[PDB]
Enzyme design. Structure first.
Site, PDB file in Angstrom:
ATOM      1  N   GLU A  35      27.947  84.334  51.364  1.00  0.00           N
ATOM      2  CA  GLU A  35      29.274  84.126  51.446  1.00  0.00           C
ATOM      3  C   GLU A  35      29.963  84.195  52.866  1.00  0.00           C
ATOM      4  OE1 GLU A  35      31.436  83.033  49.426  1.00  0.00           O
ATOM      5  OE2 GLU A  35      30.542  83.380  47.349  1.00  0.00           O
ATOM      6  N   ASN A  46      40.441  77.193  51.591  1.00  0.00           N
ATOM      7  CA  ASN A  46      40.284  76.267  50.771  1.00  0.00           C
ATOM      8  C   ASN A  46      41.153  74.932  50.688  1.00  0.00           C
ATOM      9  OD1 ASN A  46      40.000  79.496  49.044  1.00  0.00           O
ATOM     10  ND2 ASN A  46      38.239  78.153  49.398  1.00  0.00           N
ATOM     11  N   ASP A  48      42.859  74.001  48.324  1.00  0.00           N
ATOM     12  CA  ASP A  48      44.070  74.220  47.392  1.00  0.00           C
ATOM     13  C   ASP A  48      45.052  75.061  48.140  1.00  0.00           C
ATOM     14  OD1 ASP A  48      42.991  76.829  47.484  1.00  0.00           O
ATOM     15  OD2 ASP A  48      42.799  76.963  45.410  1.00  0.00           O
ATOM     16  N   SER A  50      44.606  78.021  49.223  1.00  0.00           N
ATOM     17  CA  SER A  50      44.231  79.363  49.189  1.00  0.00           C
ATOM     18  C   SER A  50      43.227  79.770  50.344  1.00  0.00           C
ATOM     19  CB  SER A  50      43.789  79.794  47.892  1.00  0.00           C
ATOM     20  OG  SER A  50      42.267  79.194  47.677  1.00  0.00           O
ATOM     21  N   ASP A  52      39.798  82.400  51.408  1.00  0.00           N
ATOM     22  CA  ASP A  52      38.612  83.611  50.944  1.00  0.00           C
ATOM     23  C   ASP A  52      38.702  84.429  52.278  1.00  0.00           C
ATOM     24  OD1 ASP A  52      38.267  81.988  48.886  1.00  0.00           O
ATOM     25  OD2 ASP A  52      36.701  80.897  49.750  1.00  0.00           O
ATOM     26  N   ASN A  59      39.368  85.607  47.216  1.00  0.00           N
ATOM     27  CA  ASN A  59      40.212  84.430  47.087  1.00  0.00           C
ATOM     28  C   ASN A  59      41.591  84.949  47.148  1.00  0.00           C
ATOM     29  OD1 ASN A  59      41.723  81.893  45.599  1.00  0.00           O
ATOM     30  ND2 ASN A  59      40.609  81.344  47.725  1.00  0.00           N
TER      31      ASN A  59
END
Ligand SMILES: [Br-]
Ligand SMILES: [Br-]
Ligand SMILES: [Br-]
Ligand SMILES: [Br-]
Ligand SMILES: [Br-]
Ligand SMILES: [Br-]
Ligand SMILES: [Br-]
Ligand SMILES: [Br-]
Ligand SMILES: [Br-]
Ligand code: NA
Length: 129
Positions: A35, A46, A48, A50, A52, A59
């Site tokens: 990760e 991301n 969308d 959003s 992380d 997220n």
């Protein structure tokens, strides 16, 4: 902060992640590896909108507030920035909530694709735990 492999295993065990919801320490370390590559300051945007954050790339859509993810929630009740601290307490607390959400560690797509069903013991091998 960029943790070493065994250093993170120790910190994760200390914070009660060893077999939390049935997931062995090696799973959590493997998840962190792929990760964030063990870097607390890792961020990734991301499509969308959003973002992380942290060792476990938690997220902003559901779990933390970064103030720039329209219609999102803050279920861990923390600023997303807290997830970037060298102290992984916020990330661990929040992760415990995520993995208890119903789909286990499948919530972390890197875990499912790169850790799930592998010899996760290898990630804590040699470590003084
Ligand atoms: Br490594
Ligand atoms: Br603790
Ligand atoms: Br393990
Ligand atoms: Br927001
Ligand atoms: Br907040
Ligand atoms: Br906040
Ligand atoms: Br820590
Ligand atoms: Br904790
Ligand atoms: Br599960
Ligand atoms: Na949010």
């Amino acid at each position: 902060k960029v943790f070493g492999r065994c250093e993170l295993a120790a910190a994760m065990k200390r914070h009660g992640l060893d077999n939390y919801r049935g997931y062995s320490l090696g799973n959590w370390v493997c998840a962190a590896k792929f990760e964030s590559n063990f870097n607390t300051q890792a961020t990734n945007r991301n499509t969308d909108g959003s973002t992380d954050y942290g060792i476990l790339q938690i997220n902003s859509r559901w779990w933390c507030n970064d103030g720039r993810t329209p219609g999102s929630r803050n279920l861990c009740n923390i600023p997303c920035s807290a997830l970037l601290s060298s102290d992984i307490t916020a990330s661990v607390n929040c992760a415990k909530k995520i993995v208890s959400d119903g789909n286990g560690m499948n919530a972390w797509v890197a875990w499912r694709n790169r850790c799930k069903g592998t010899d996760v013991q290898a990630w804590i091998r040699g470590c003084r735990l």
